[PDB]
């Protein structure tokens, strides 16, 4: 009778630096993204998160807004520079924000899902080497354990890292994200230290044996298609798939980096950070996996160089990011996890959503019909996965509101709610009204 059971969580997601603002208040010190956004050329028109959506001050209105939509769960991140503004220096005022945030959520029947690290590493940590310095495993563990002990009565669903592929390859190899290095060997080592920090937090978490509390990790995953049936394109797809997906799925869920990628990367950089003890910590059992899904890739062999597959445009509709709208890969990825990696483990879609050219019309409304159709198509694939025996527990739309989209600044709008940044006014887009109906009827 219900496409989505009463227990299925309809959610929305944000991230601290993208929405909070109040960047220099109540003891907060700079993150690497504060620093990076002030370096010339790194962020669209030198946008930064100084103010963002001012959600730090407006959080009560934002929670009321979610309550009126019937939101059942809210994924947010916790800002490390608020909690430890300096090495070893706990800031109770920073903790107080997350207590009053999560108190507000619970009192409005919204379940909190907290992301421990969503890219806003404290500048003091990066000055000590950041994710390149293996000591970060201990700094992160100290941070996580403080959150578990202070917030464990408030939060029962924890995510160690958001999208470690971005924090490693996009930040240290491609250089689009903070801190903006361009060195494959660095990005490979960072990926390992991120995964090792993840394992440290899981170890600490299990030792607390908190009542009714779950821990997992969030991975951005795609599906890679070869442009043709040639052997050239099949190897290209295999490499692209190992680069995005298997490089993280395999150590976490198989206890082993993917050997084809280890050999491929080893032709270009050192891969000597791999060892048995680290992989055992990395692959500790999780309670759930969070899946961030947006699009697929169609790839063709490039010119034999490092990760130089040519991106094929198959000619289909795309978002403002240039990302193809291909809802079937949401089903294919969830099925692939079920058949190859996570099996019967609970799965959450921790991000899915789209950037479109949103405009407030003369009627004061945002008629974002393309986003309505986008979300409708992807929720239909989630329902199909559930009806085929998939263990999907919830679905978080990215994002609750338009926000600071990293190197794109405020020029990409992902919200189901529009933010007029001059006034900080919230305007429900038609997609939020559609989502409200979906939560109410649980029918699609
Ligand atoms: Na901010
Ligand atoms: Na700036
Ligand atoms: Na696991
Ligand atoms: Na679980
Ligand atoms: Na499709």
Automatic annotation (TrEMBL):
SUPFAM superfamilies: (Trans)glycosidases. The lineage of its organism: Bacteria, Bacillati, Bacillota, Clostridia, Thermoanaerobacterales. It catalyses: Hydrolysis of terminal, non-reducing beta-D-glucosyl residues with release of beta-D-glucose. The keyword Hydrolase applies. GO terms for cellular component: cytosol. GO terms for molecular function: beta-glucosidase activity. Gene3D superfamilies: Glycosidases (3.20.20.80). It is an enzyme of class 3 (hydrolase). It comes from Thermoanaerobacterium saccharolyticum (strain DSM 8691 / JW/SL-YS485). Its EC number is 3.2.1.21. GO terms for biological process: cellulose catabolic process. Substrate binds at residues 18, 118, 162, 294, 398, 405-406. Keywords: Carbohydrate metabolism, Cellulose degradation, Glycosidase, Hydrolase, Polysaccharide degradation. InterPro entries: GH, GH_1_N_CS, Glyco_hydro_1, Glyco_hydro_1_AS, Glyco_hydro_1_beta-glucosidase. PANTHER family: GLYCOSYL HYDROLASE, LP05116P. NCBIfam families: BGL. This is beta-glucosidase.
């Amino acid at each position: 009778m219900l496409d989505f059971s009463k227990d299925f969580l309809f959610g929305v997601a944000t991230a601290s630096y993208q929405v909070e603002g109040a960047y220099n208040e109540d003891g907060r010190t700079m993150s690497i993204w504060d620093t990076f956004s002030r370096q010339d050329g790194k962020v669209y028109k030198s946008h930064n998160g100084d103010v963002a959506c001012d959600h730090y001050h407006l959080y009560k209105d934002d929670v009321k807004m979610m309550k009126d939509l019937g939101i059942e769960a809210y994924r947010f991140s916790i800002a490390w520079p608020r909690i430890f503004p300096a090495k070893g220096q706990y800031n109770p005022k920073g903790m107080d924000f997350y207590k009053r945030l999560t108190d507000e959520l619970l009192k409005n029947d919204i379940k909190p899902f907290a992301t421990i690290y969503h890219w806003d590493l404290p500048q003091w940590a990066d000055d000590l080497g950041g994710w390149l310095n293996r000591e970060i495993v201990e700094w992160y563990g100290e941070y996580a354990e403080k959150l578990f002990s202070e917030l464990g009565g408030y939060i029962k669903n924890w995510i160690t890292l958001n999208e470690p592929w971005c924090s490693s390859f996009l930040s240290y190899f491609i250089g689009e994200h903070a801190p903006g290095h361009k060195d494959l060997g660095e990005a490979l080592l960072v990926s390992h230290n991120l995964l090792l920090s993840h394992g440290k937090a899981v170890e600490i978490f299990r030792g607390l044996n908190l009542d009714d509390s779950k821990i997992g990790i969030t991975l951005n995953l795609n599906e890679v298609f070869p442009a043709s049936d040639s052997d050239d394109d099949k190897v290209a797809a295999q490499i692209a798939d190992g680069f995005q997906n298997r490089w993280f799925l395999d150590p976490l869920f198989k206890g082993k980096y993917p050997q084809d990628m280890v050999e491929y990367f080893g032709k270009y950089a050192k891969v000597d950070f791999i060892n048995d003890e680290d992989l055992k910590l990395i692959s500790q059992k999780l309670d759930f996996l969070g899946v961030n899904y947006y699009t697929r890739a169609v790839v063709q062999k490039g010119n034999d160089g490092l990760l130089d597959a040519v991106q094929i445009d198959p000619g289909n509709e795309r978002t403002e990011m240039g990302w193809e709208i291909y809802p079937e890969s949401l089903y294919n990825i969830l099925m692939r996890l079920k058949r190859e990696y996570t099996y019967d483990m609970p799965l959450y879609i921790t991000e899915n959503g789209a950037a479109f050219n949103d405009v407030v019309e003369d009627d004061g409304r945002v008629h974002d019909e393309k986003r309505v159709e986008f979300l409708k198509q992807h929720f239909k694939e989630a329902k199909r996965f559930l009806n085929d025996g998939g263990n999907l527990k919830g679905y978080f739309v990215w994002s609750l509101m338009d926000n600071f989209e990293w190197a794109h600044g405020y020029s990409k709008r992902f919200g189901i709610v529009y933010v007029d940044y001059e006034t900080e006014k919230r305007i429900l887009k038609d997609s939020a009204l559609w989502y409200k109906d979906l939560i109410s009827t649980r029918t699609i």
